[PDB]
């Protein structure tokens, strides 16, 4: 199986998430488009600069890079360190924040910052796309953002290598190796899945099953994973995701 | 050619131009006001005239006024409620740009009569663009009329009076001195309906022209 057709789309996406910006993506798409519009002139022209030749030969690679770079710049909500405002930041109502037992808070605020609390009963709501721009100006953005970025990267890696392990089965099917299936692909893929698919569904389960009503003494993903890996099951100290999970 | 001008096909374009500018000149240029009075138990804290003004883009969520706090003679800020620019601004910009397209079509009928008759191409693109703009107007005008109705229910003084704890205090009773007026917006939406009807009729006549 030729991996090139799959790379044609995988590789732009991975370079985009590795270059996750809107404006820069635009600039280097402009560069690639300048290569493509000047195709005929450059073709009939000597260019001893081998770097130029090597980048030009894969110019359509650069176009794909930049298209996916623009798309990820949009989803990440970043453009020269600035978020895009569709004015859909409908989560935290500020006059209602004053209504929420914050009376003359500005008097203290002249020297402090007064982080907004979770579940005041009056907040809630997502952003239309990507991250809310309120986090683009927040100080807790470092704690908020980097965590699900980590978990996201794990997810994407798992799906990619799943795809590779399926390609190995396709090779086995073509070349008639029943030994490479019974003792090969099937056992190893179930080996991988029985850990990482469980990790994925646990991640999503917590993401959609625990809210800020349970923030105090909430579970922890890594602690539960360590409990699994070490066969340690303390009675208390870690809120249990669901009964019978042990 | 004066015959082409005398044809109703372009005269309706002229009518559309005029009544479209008349529509969106008053859709997003109306202003009004409403005044409030506070009957405080302490006469020193009481008020009689509290001016509040509203105008396009009609972002009530970003408008505020100061009224007595009913506590030691202080005051407090009162932010109105409602993001009605999300429809008003969109509809106004929509009307502006499609009216510019109407000017373009009138120009096509005026000078480029030769290319207009050339292979019947002018009628094709004009009809298609006009139908697209008519559907867009239907959506935008319906949304903006619903937003106008939302503004109308939002202008009731008793709602803001009952929402305010200081007005709910005994002996502190805030009555609206002057109620708001929104007749110009009614005229504006009537103009919008007239524009829609005119363009539908012109679509019929243009389809007759094509065949």
């Amino acid at each position: 199986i030729n991996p090139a057709p799959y790379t044609v789309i995988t590789f732009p996406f991975l370079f985009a998430v590795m270059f996750g910006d809107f404006g820069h993506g635009i600039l280097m798409t402009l560069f690639a488009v300048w290569m493509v519009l000047r195709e005929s002139r450059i073709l009939s022209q000597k260019h001893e600069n081998e770097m130029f030749s090597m980048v030009f030969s894969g110019r359509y690679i650069i176009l794909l890079m930049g298209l996916f770079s623009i798309y990820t710049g949009l989803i990440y909500n970043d453009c020269f360190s600035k978020s895009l405002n569709i004015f859909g930041s409908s989560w935290s109502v500020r006059p209602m924040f004053t209504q929420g037992n914050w009376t003359e808070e500005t008097l203290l605020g002249s020297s402090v910052l007064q982080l907004n609390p979770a579940i005041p009963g009056v907040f809630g709501g997502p952003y239309p796309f990507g991250i809310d721009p309120i986090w683009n100006i927040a100080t807790n953005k470092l704690t908020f953002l980097n965590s699900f970025k980590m978990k996201m990267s794990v997810i994407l890696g798992i799906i990619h290598m799943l795809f590779g392990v399926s390609l190995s089965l396709f090779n086995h099917i073509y070349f008639k190796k029943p030994l490479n299936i019974y003792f090969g692909f099937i056992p190893e893929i179930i080996f991988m899945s029985s850990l990482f698919g469980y990790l994925v569904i646990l991640i999503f389960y917590k993401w959609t099953a625990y809210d800020a009503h349970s923030s105090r003494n909430a579970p922890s993903l890594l602690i539960h994973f360590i409990n699994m890996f070490l066969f340690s099951y303390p009675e208390s100290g870690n809120a249990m995701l669901y009964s019978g999970q042990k | 050619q004066f015959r082409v001008v005398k044809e109703p096909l372009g005269f309706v374009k002229v009518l559309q131009w005029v009544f479209a500018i008349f529509a969106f000149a008053t859709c997003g240029s109306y202003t009004g006001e409403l005044r409030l009075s506070v009957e405080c138990a302490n006469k020193t804290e009481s008020a009689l005239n509290i001016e509040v003004e509203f105008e396009y883009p009609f972002r009530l969520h970003q408008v505020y006024f100061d009224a007595p706090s009913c506590v030691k003679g202080g005051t407090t800020k009162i932010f109105l409620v409602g993001d009605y620019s999300s429809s008003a601004e969109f509809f106004v910009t929509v009307a502006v740009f499609a009216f510019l397209y109407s000017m373009g079509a009138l120009a096509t009928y005026i000078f480029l009569q030769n290319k207009y008759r050339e292979n019947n191409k002018g009628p094709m693109m004009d009809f298609l663009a006009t139908a697209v703009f008519a559907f867009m107007w239907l959506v935008s005008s319906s949304a903006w009329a619903k937003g106008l109705s939302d503004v109308k229910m939002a202008t009731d003084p008793e709602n803001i009076i009952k929402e305010m704890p200081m007005c709910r205090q005994t002996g502190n009773t805030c009555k609206e001195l002057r109620d708001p007026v929104t007749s110009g917006l009614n005229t504006s939406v009537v103009f919008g309906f007239l524009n829609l009807v005119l363009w539908v009729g012109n679509l019929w006549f243009v389809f007759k022209e094509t065949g």
């Binding site: 300048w34 405002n85 100006i137 | -």
Partner: protein, 86 residues
């Protein structure tokens, strides 16, 4: 001829990118009224009387970039003239 495109194509492209950037930032200074979420920096020390002075300041701030926009426009025009010296 004089000031050939081999040394002025960079001028052309940078002038174009600069003018697009500048009008984008200017419309975000003026029409958006320089929303502090998208543009935190400002220079004000006393604003307890209301946000009116900052609203006035938005006008001067949006003016500050159209000057550079005109400078880039004339630079691009003269660079294109140099390129046309062929």
């Amino acid at each position: 001829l004089c000031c050939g495109p081999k040394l002025a194509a960079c001028g052309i492209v940078l002038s174009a990118w600069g003018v697009i950037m500048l009008i984008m930032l200017g419309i975000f200074f003026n029409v958006h009224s320089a929303v502090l979420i998208e543009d935190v920096p400002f220079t004000e020390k006393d604003f307890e009387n209301g946000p009116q002075n900052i609203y006035n300041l938005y006008e001067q701030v949006s003016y500050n970039c159209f000057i550079a926009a005109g400078l880039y426009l004339l630079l691009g025009g003269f660079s294109f003239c140099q390129v046309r010296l062929n």
